Ligand binder design. Structure first.
Ligand code: CL
Ligand code: CL
Ligand code: CL
Lengths: 250, 251, 250
């Protein structure tokens, strides 16, 4: 791996976002493929859970648009179709993943950076982290199943303040909305996380998987279907003159 | 031309102002419902990217005008309840089918049917002094506007029932904590803040706006139509009963 | 009876948990069979609604596992089936119940004492009450349909802070999450519940039965299947060696 660090500790595996092929941990095709491959290996591991974290001032600014736009500019529906396929499979990996994923957010989560969070099982955020899905600004419709997961958590109209209006949520605001599930003090953030993760790793593996399987059970199909619907709209938008024009805006 | 509402076709948005003259406090009667349906239908058809739905006076909407309805019900109960139920069902259905985003601006109390329609819109912008109430149990009715499912969806069932059964009032800030309101504004800058935020929304791409709304409502639109049918059948039963009329007369 | 008091007042029946057979209103087979009997009776009453309350320092500390681990020790195959069957029928009684159930929580609600709350219609809690489902310390999968009701009400990530992380919620934070529906000041708690309950019981019977029917019809089938799936998983955990090893800790 070039763009992530994977550390298999006592009963859990840390996947750390730490990109060098991109800035601010943006996701290009190759970063996404390392994540998918690291997750696939943790699934085959004897890890009980995954900690998903990031290094740097930003957690994840989401899709690297500079990278995708260059590909989209030799033409056409092709680059469009490939990029959606990549996003589709990325989101699905999270949807299908059987072990708990605890996400540690120590900086802004933006776009696909924020929209995959509700696909995880616990979301622990530094009080300094913030969250946004500036879709209307990007000129796209929702990704990461957010068209269903934001309304389920916070209700339609609060979901829309993020999906339609593009508003930033502080960590505390996102937690009252259900997007973050626990807020931590900045000074002691990383040690607070490790202590609580080692506690979680100390529990029984069968009860952790069975609890996730029972919460997973009814929601999985809905998420697969949301992802499919989201991807179909992105295919349409990203192969339109309009959609391409929008992605080109910085 | 409209008697009870004002429609403003603005820069990339349509503005529908509830401003009734034939009822008090923006109460809804048959005639006010039909104008609103009509205005929505026209906004659906023209090149507005979105609708701003608002009100004038000291209340947003006090819901159904029961003084107006109990008079017809008193004359022919079987026939008048079918009518009442048809117009409400179709009022609600108009909001369920509307494909463009509806932003509602609430600048005073929203009561009964005036609160229960809010969850069918897309953003709910409230002045800090607005409050919200569905006193169905006080009125002597069951839920309307799909609130039987939209309130449990946004709040959880028990919190839903504090509004649906217990008849409790929510300030704008506590309605915001429960998902019914989505943004709260200081009273001093309410309408100017609303107007700037609406123009920035109207600056966005129409296809992005409508696709996003379509995606969000996809797995729920059927559920809403079905709730509205269920609700209105119970309402038909209650408003055609001796107890129902009596309850309505005491409002 | 022995462990409960039934009080049939003007338009409502009150069921009071005050256990002598267990400590802190914990549930054994006998306490559970009494609650089921009271409920079935109340369903046949002319009462418009049920008030469910408790006496003592705690509301309900959940399953009495010191009682259960005992009978599981010798006959480790069929004592589990017996235990899960009692639990499944206890939960089903709430799922099926047709009149409103208001629950009054005047102290901690722990484990199955907490997870049955979402099955009732209103949950009035003293500000001093707190809520916990410490399943992963118990070493069990969720019970009471918490696998679907906690996620539905508060979002999946917030739900897992309870389901997986075993976190305690005060009455106020349980109210922000949708689990409690009204918090009361402690000095007048009792007075206020009785006043508000007689208020509710003064409403038209037809309209109370119908708001409950309109809320209930969309969700009951889901609740029944969650119960079935939760019970199956508990069959397995509680009959396994590591399960019984878990059940031993007070
Ligand atoms: Cl950096
Ligand atoms: Cl006025
Ligand atoms: Cl005691």
């Amino acid at each position: 791996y070039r763009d992530i660090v994977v550390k298999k500790e006592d009963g859990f595996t840390q996947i750390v976002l730490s990109t060098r092929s991109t800035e601010k941990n943006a996701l290009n095709t190759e970063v996404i493929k390392e994540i998918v491959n690291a997750l696939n290996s943790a699934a085959a591991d004897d890890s009980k859970l995954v900690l998903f974290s990031a290094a740097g001032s930003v957690f994840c600014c989401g899709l690297d648009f500079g990278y995708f736009v260059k590909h989209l500019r030799n033409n056409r529906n092709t680059a469009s179709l490939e990029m959606v396929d990549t996003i589709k499979n990325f989101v699905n990996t999270f949807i299908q993943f059987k072990k708990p994923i605890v996400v540690s957010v120590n900086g802004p989560a933006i776009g696909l950076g924020a929209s995959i969070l509700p696909l995880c099982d616990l979301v622990w955020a530094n009080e300094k982290a913030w969250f946004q899905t500036p879709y209307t600004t990007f000129g796209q419709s929702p990704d990461g199943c957010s068209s269903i997961t934001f309304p389920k958590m916070m209700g339609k109209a609060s979901a829309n303040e993020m999906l339609i209006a593009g508003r930033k949520l502080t960590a505390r605001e996102a937690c009252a909305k259900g997007l973050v599930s626990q807020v931590f003090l900045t000074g002691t953030f990383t040690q607070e996380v490790m202590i609580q993760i080692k506690e979680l790793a100390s529990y029984n593996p069968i009860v952790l998987e069975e609890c996730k399987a029972l919460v997973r059970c009814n929601i999985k199909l809905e998420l697969e279907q949301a992802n499919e619907r989201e991807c179909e709209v992105l295919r349409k938008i990203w192969s339109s003159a309009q959609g391409i024009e929008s992605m080109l805006k910085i």
